[PDB]
Amino acid sequence: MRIPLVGKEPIEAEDMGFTLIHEHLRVFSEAVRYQWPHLYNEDEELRNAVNEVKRAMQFGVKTIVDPTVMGLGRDIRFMEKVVKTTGINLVAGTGIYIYVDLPFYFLNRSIDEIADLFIHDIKEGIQATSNKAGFVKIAADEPGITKDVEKVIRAAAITHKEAKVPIITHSNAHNNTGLEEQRILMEEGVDPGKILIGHLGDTDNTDYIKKIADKGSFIGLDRYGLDLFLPVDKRNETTLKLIKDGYSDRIMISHDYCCTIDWGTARPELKPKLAPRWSMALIFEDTIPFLKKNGVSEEVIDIIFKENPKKFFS
Amino acid sequence: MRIPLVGKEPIEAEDMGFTLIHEHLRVFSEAVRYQWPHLYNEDEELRNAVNEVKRAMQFGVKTIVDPTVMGLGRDIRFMEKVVKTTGINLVAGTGIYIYVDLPFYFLNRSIDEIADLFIHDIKEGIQATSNKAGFVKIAADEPGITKDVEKVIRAAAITHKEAKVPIITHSNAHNNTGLEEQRILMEEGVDPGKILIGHLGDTDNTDYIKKIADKGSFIGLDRYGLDLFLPVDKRNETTLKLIKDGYSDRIMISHDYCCTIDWGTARPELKPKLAPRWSMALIFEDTIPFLKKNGVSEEVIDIIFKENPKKFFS
Ligand SMILES: [Co+2]
Ligand SMILES: [Co+2]
Ligand SMILES: [Fe+2]
Ligand SMILES: [Fe+2]
């Protein structure tokens, strides 16, 4: 009814279950892959995905939210592929993933026709497949909020009030880009409780994370395993600190794991040293057990992975 | 032998004939089209291309050089498609078309692995099709020369000395980006007589065009029809001025025509007003007849469309 899915009927919101709010089956750069597919292996990418998913459903993961959109190589027909061999609840989304500028096609185009693209994937269907998006993704990083960056953000604020779907953001933790994202969305009639400032777990600063959580929006401690931004343990203490400070009603956890990633700054041979234990179920081996071992109840974990996402999708 | 082609054997250089140095069968943004192909029509795009080409071979056009690369939607299998139904000499190329930054895949990647991509298309084959590139394309515009912009330029300077193929540039006429492109290439052991600073016909300033031509490189009066940069007549007088000033040995002419272009800032309904007569054979109806009518011999036109390109490919 409310929450769309992939290769399956649309759920409501309370039947969402244990959810991994931020994960990636596989990412790639549309341009290169389309120009040189001799570098890729549909098979290797399908297996890793399949293998990684089935193991998340074990630890009790019910629904996986995949924020793969334009620029990350969103393949809806590749999404159904794995959903069929694993039977996973996969919420597809829309939007555009960028840091600086838009593709050339966007030259001299209004912000509306941009939000038009998103509104199309929500109500019509992603890539003419019927599978609709459940949200909209937007990204800001080191280069901070620029012209093209802001255009997409405001186009998200519109795709939100018109479709009623939520929006998940991608930001640099030490930048303030997260706050900027929250502000620019809030000023445009965007429901804070309907915005996920992500990756803000890549930093110790608990005051920056708090104020953003105080602003009403969901905070993103979503990149566990990626030690290169912040080691696992350094991350666990942060989550901890906030849980005791009563921010669990806004804390959402995930990995941001890419079964197969395109960038060279994250080669499969770069795993060790950069992200040794980074996986789709790392928070089951380390994080969760860590909290319950430090005095956090079962209600909190079910709140984070169940009740928080439910409030995010309705 | 020297000059590679598409769906045919590689020519030498003197058998190049009358050539349109800069033309586009069709351009599109890899990302969007790959994410939403419901906006495109393989058919409409094939016909326009086919129709436009056959009419250029009439006016005596022997070889067409298509500078469509990453970012413009280079489709080698779509190139052979038309080459077969028209039997045209089509020189494919490589490189990257940008204004600001590279795709994410290029994050933390050396300039070598970039030139590696180009060197692959030259000696191995474009997109694993055997069809090799005859040159490398690079672009700079209003945003001028930036980090990512310069990285590709220097990666071109390398792909040039190692493969021996020439490089065609895309620049803003009123910016100096053209000169910047020439300089950064020259400083890296790049043969000026092996660089095509393009689009510098979009401006009156004949002193800027001259110095660039004096620097040894080929000048680009290559966008006839696109009145929006400079009307046809305003362009003709410029070419004229330089021909009388003995710069014809460096003048190369084309249209830069896109049978089917992706950007909205150039919609098929925007043709009139922006570029009314813009086509693949506009210089036959207007330009050429104009010169021979103002006292320029037959040797000059054959030099521009035959001898100049021959020196550019060898
Ligand atoms: Co992200
Ligand atoms: Co150009
Ligand atoms: Fe992500
Ligand atoms: Fe062009």
Residue numbers in the entry:
A (entry chain A), B (entry chain A): 1 to 314
Authors' description from the paper:
SisLac is homodimeric in the crystal structure with overall dimensions of the monomers of being approximately 39×48×56 Å. As for its close homolog SsoPox and related PLLs like DrOPH, GsP and GkL, SisLac is roughly globular and exhibits a (β/α)8 barrel topology. The active site consists of a binuclear center located at the C-Terminal of the barrel. Four histidines (His22, His24, His170, His199), one aspartic acid (Asp256) and a carboxylated lysine (residue 137) are coordinating the two metals. The two metal cations (possibly iron and cobalt, as seen for SsoPox and OpdA) are bridged by a water molecule that is presumed to be the catalytic nucleophile. The active site includes a long hydrophobic channel that was revealed by structural studies on SsoPox as the binding region of aliphatic chains for the AHL substrates. Indeed, SisLac’s structure is overall very similar to the structure of SsoPox (root-mean-square deviation (r.m.s.d.) for α-carbon atoms (over 314 atoms) of 0.35 Å). The dimer interface of SisLac comprises 46 residues (44 in SsoPox). The nature of this interface is mainly hydrophobic in both enzymes, but SisLac’s interface tends to be more hydrophobic (56% for SisLac, 52.6% for SsoPox), more charged (SisLac 23.91%, SsoPox 20.45%) and less polar (SisLac 32.61%, SsoPox 36.36%). Q34Y is indeed a key substitution in the interface since it consists in a “pivot” residue, i.e. a residue that contacts its equivalent in the second protein molecule while forming the dimer, and seems to be responsible for the observed dimerization shift between SisLac and SsoPox structures.
